[PDB]
Design an enzyme around this catalytic site. Structure first.
Site, PDB file in Angstrom:
ATOM      1  N   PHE A  11       0.801  -1.215   0.000  1.00 21.70           N
ATOM      2  CA  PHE A  11       0.000   0.000   0.000  1.00 21.70           C
ATOM      3  C   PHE A  11       0.828   1.257   0.000  1.00 21.70           C
ATOM      4  CE2 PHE A  11      -2.965  -2.712   2.500  1.00 21.70           C
ATOM      5  CZ  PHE A  11      -4.085  -2.566   1.711  1.00 21.70           C
ATOM      6  N   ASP A  12       0.380   2.236  -0.771  1.00 22.05           N
ATOM      7  CA  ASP A  12       0.651   3.602  -0.388  1.00 22.05           C
ATOM      8  C   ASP A  12      -0.215   3.917   0.840  1.00 22.05           C
ATOM      9  OD1 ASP A  12       1.455   6.486  -0.901  1.00 22.05           O
ATOM     10  OD2 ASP A  12      -0.756   6.615  -0.831  1.00 22.05           O
ATOM     11  N   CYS A  13       0.310   4.696   1.781  1.00 23.54           N
ATOM     12  CA  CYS A  13      -0.509   5.181   2.885  1.00 23.54           C
ATOM     13  C   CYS A  13      -1.138   6.550   2.604  1.00 23.54           C
ATOM     14  CB  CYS A  13       0.314   5.250   4.171  1.00 23.54           C
ATOM     15  SG  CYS A  13      -0.648   5.925   5.559  1.00 23.54           S
TER      16      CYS A  13
END
Length: 233
Positions: A11-13
């Site tokens: 994931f990108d956060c």
């Protein structure tokens, strides 16, 4: 090509799970109120983006708060105000206040049941720890720009992540890179040979090209629901 073909979500956060845009709009309120002017959210984001650009470096600073503090000073100046030390302190530490999108927590809690969950963040690990507290799940691996020595979309960020995952038993083909940003995440995901899930959020930095994406969901909630539907047959 099915969401069940994968074992790990990378994931990108910030922009995908945490709503940084709203976080910045909120964080700018004290300074903005001091101007006496009323800004739209788009106007605030334009001012932030234009003033964050000159803070960009190749080697990441150790602490993201230093970028935010520098941006604060620049924005105060742009708005014809003297910087205020207390306002700067609060703006610089604001990541902890940036909210999750309303769908994020329930979606992550569902997906945590089924996938190894990984974070690839351009914001430092200590700030991420504060965000993680409101995300509702434990992540299996957290990789940051400081670890890598560059910010995504540098390919080293993806290579580092892929290598870390390989050592943890996850083959490259079993990774689904899940992110909002075509520029920061999906272009390099393409170049690293990963499959992509584009969480498009508010769609509709300019990516040099449109990357290929294998899945498109408006939100993390929609992605979770698609997984549930896939299991139903």
């Amino acid at each position: 090509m099915q969401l069940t073909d994968f074992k790990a979500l990378t994931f990108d956060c910030y922009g995908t799970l945490i709503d940084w845009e709203t976080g910045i709009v909120n964080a700018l309120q004290p300074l903005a109120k001091r101007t006496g002017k009323t800004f739209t959210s788009d106007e605030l984001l334009e001012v932030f983006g234009r003033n964050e650009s000159p803070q960009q470096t190749e080697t990441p600073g150790a602490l993201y708060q230093d970028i935010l503090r520098a941006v604060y000073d620049r924005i105060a100046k742009e708005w014809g105000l003297e910087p205020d030390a207390a306002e700067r302190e609060e703006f610089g530490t604001s990541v902890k206040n940036w909210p999750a999108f309303p769908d994020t927590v329930e979606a992550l809690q569902y997906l945590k049941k089924h996938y190894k969950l990984v974070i690839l963040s351009n914001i430092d690990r200590n700030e991420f720890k504060l965000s993680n507290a409101k995300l509702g799940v434990e992540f299996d691996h957290i990789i940051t720009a400081q670890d890598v020595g560059s910010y995504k979309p540098n390919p080293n960020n993806f290579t580092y992540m892929i290598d870390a995952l390989a050592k943890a038993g996850i083959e490259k083909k079993d990774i689904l890179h899940t992110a909002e940003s075509l520029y920061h995440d999906h272009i390099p995901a393409n170049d690293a040979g990963l499959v992509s899930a584009w969480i498009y959020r508010r769609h509709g930095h300019v990516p040099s090209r449109m990357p290929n994406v294998d899945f498109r969901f408006n939100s993390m909630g929609e992605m979770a629901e698609a997984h549930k539907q896939a299991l139903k047959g």
